[PDB]
């Protein structure tokens with residue numbers, strides 16, 4: 001469920017090799033997505 | 040047991056419900072048929088709301104627990120920033136947290152954002168109170184991994200605000216405060232806090248502009264230091280200014296990056312995860328909003344709402360914990376409502392679109408996990424935190440400030456029916472009827488809000504404090520109209536400048552009832568703490584005449600209130616030196632202009648402290664003076680023995696003290712003593728203190744179980760004090776107008792006083808409801824009373840809610856100073872709400888209010 005999305009080179013938070021790790025989750029309330037900065 | 044019919048001015052009034060459908064619906068389940076979310080979306084969002092409230096020491100939702108990411112990244116930054124100026128370190132801490140935090144996006148939400156790594160979590164604050172964090176480590180909600188969290192707290196312990204402040208007080212004094220008996224514990228020990236964010240600056244200017252202002256100031260300061268000839272007595276001033284401005288830049292750049300990364304998450308989900316095309320388009324709209332906002336000025340209502348929510352997260356959760364939701368939301372959002380709904384220049388919207396947006400705001404606030412200490416959760420059962428926004432009132436010219444944004448805010452509350460955020464309405468005679476009707480709709484639905492504050496009283500209060508400004512830049516006569524409640528009861532400036540930045544300026548409680556107990560026991564608290572709580576002001580034998588009691592109390596009060604304020608100012612001293620808030624500083628025009636930290640610069644003083652259970656101590660003194668020193672029916676030893684025996688015997692004696700003239704009955708004898716007590720002791724001795732900002736400290740009465748047997752006829756630990764200046768539960772026996780006449784007698788040396796009043800359901804929900812209420816408010820205002828809030832709910836429905844809680848979820852009631860779902864309050868609290876006297880209105884009452892039908 002771990003998807004990596006490379007940070008665009010024109011982004012304010014851009015660093016070499018940085019990406020957004022976006023995961024989808026769902027519990028009893030409902031669905032949501034988590035974006036964690038990784039290398 | 041309430042009237043359904045009343046003859047008045049030769050006219051028979053039929054107190055029958057407006058909507059005939061209400062006659063069909065059973066009275067014991069009325070409030071389960073009132074909610075009406077504007078859209079299917081907000082209906083879904085409420086049903087699946089990630090509630091963050093708790094009661095009896097545990098969260099009602101099972102997944103709620105503490106996060107660790109804030110702790111982790113704040114620690115990492117602090118280790119790395121060693122040696123650097125503290126303002127810059129604090130900015131770097133914020134930046135690291137924001138840069139590395141896992142961000143959250145949920146289905147159906149339009150206002151996006153969160154303050155922890157998981158939508159069910161809340162962040163913690165090791166930089167504030169070591170003890171508070173330790174409590175969570177010893178709970179079912181500890182941040183994980185527990186070992187890392189423990190290591191983090193130990194690292195922060197000597198750096199914490201609590202550790203900074205404690206050495207400058209006698210440990211015995213702090214011990215007395217920490218008992219939370221006569222004095223509320225100082226904020227540096229609990230981490231509790233409040234703030235009035237300068238939202239106006241963010242929405243109007245955007246953060247990019249604040250960065251350019253700071254960078255310009257830096258260059259000017261650097262140029263000044265390079266200018267021949269150097270003057271060592273002036274040139275070094277640039278250092279602290281440069282430090283603050285650089286920190287502002289770091290903080291703002293990180294907030295922009297954070298907002299845009301949030302937008303990137305929306306774009307990613309819309310392009311890779313979301314399958315609904317309608318939601319995909321919506322996520323792309325939100326992404327564009329996050330990209331521009333708050334980097335740029337807001338152009339429309341959607342921009343403004345997202346900006347405001349982002350700013351709220353930083354100022355109240357991420358940069359530092361702060362309880363509250365202080366803001367003038369209608370006035371703040373109006374230009375952007377105008378752009379969107381009225382002129383439709385950008386983000387064109389209908390009024391109902393605006394209503395839905397506010398609904399979504401209320402739900403996001405309802406999902407906001409508050410990382411307050413466990414001890415400060417127990418005081419407010421059924422709530423997640425105190426969120427109080429302000430609307431209504433008057434503009435700088437004293438004209439009506441009510442508008443259609445005000446109405447959108449009020450309708451959204453009536454529709455979505457959430458306990459939080461609560462609302463304060465500033466009432467003036469200028470306020471249009473169209474908005475007043477919306478106010479009444481909320482109140483008549485039993486929400487408990489809007490609570491009504493006296494507009495003129497607050498405005499004049501701002502003018503008075505402004506006189507004490509240390510840099511002569513207090514609120515102008517025009518700015519004085521720009522005020523909001525900080526938390527529940529205390530007025531403060533809102534706007535781009537001069538707003539209150541910390542609870543250290545004002546807030547915190549003191550308990551006159553307990554102080555009276557220990558006065559009659561040589562400063563020893565036998566009933567609760569079982570220790571020496573105050574000064575040894577003498578034994579029972581020494582106390583002669585009613586003045587000795589009146590004078591021994593002052594000595595106890597003086598000792599207590601001095602600690603209450605000095606602990607706050609010492610906190611302030613270290614807050615500005617080690618807990619700098621460069622983001623808050625960046626969006627304050629004064630901080631930006633002068634290059635000072637938000638906690639350092641204080642242009643508008645607003646010092647106050649909360650005397651709680653003052654009524655209990657008041658009614659007690661009336662019964663002492665009358666039955667001991669004017670009738671001599673009982674002696675002090677007989678009274679003291681009876682009190683320590685909790686009146687096991689002396690039952691006729693307790694009734695004798697209980698029957699003594701009380702507060703809220705227009706009783707000349709009872710009101711005579713209590714009026715002087717409110718103005719000479721409670722306010723008088725307290726006003727003698729000057730706080731950090733150079734202003735006086737004035738009382739804010741608001742809201743008992745830790746109070747022992749008192750001469751007012753109270754059993755031990757009897758928690759039935761309605762709160763503030765309102766009559767004790769069951770003490771009022773001459774109707775609502777008699778209560779209204781008593782309170783008006785207090786006019787001197789007060790900053791504010793809470794008033795709880797329960798009104799009859801059939802009247803309020805009848806077609807005559809608005810007329811009588813509006814006339815009540817009219818009278819209340821002209822009696823120059825500071826505050827009033829209402830409870831409109833029948834005993835039967837509350838009883839039914841006790842029996843079948845799963846059938847009465849949407850029942851909301853008003854407790855102390857906040858609203859909550861009735862089924863979330865423990866039985867003991869529930870029974871206390873029921874015990875409150877539901878005021879009926881007779882023909883004599885209506886004639887006093889000058890009503891017309």
Ligand SMILES: O=C(O)/C=C/C(=O)O
Pocket residue numbers: 233524525526527528529530542545546547548649739741
């Ligand atoms: O901070 C407090 O204790 C209270 C604030 C208020 O009543 O506004």
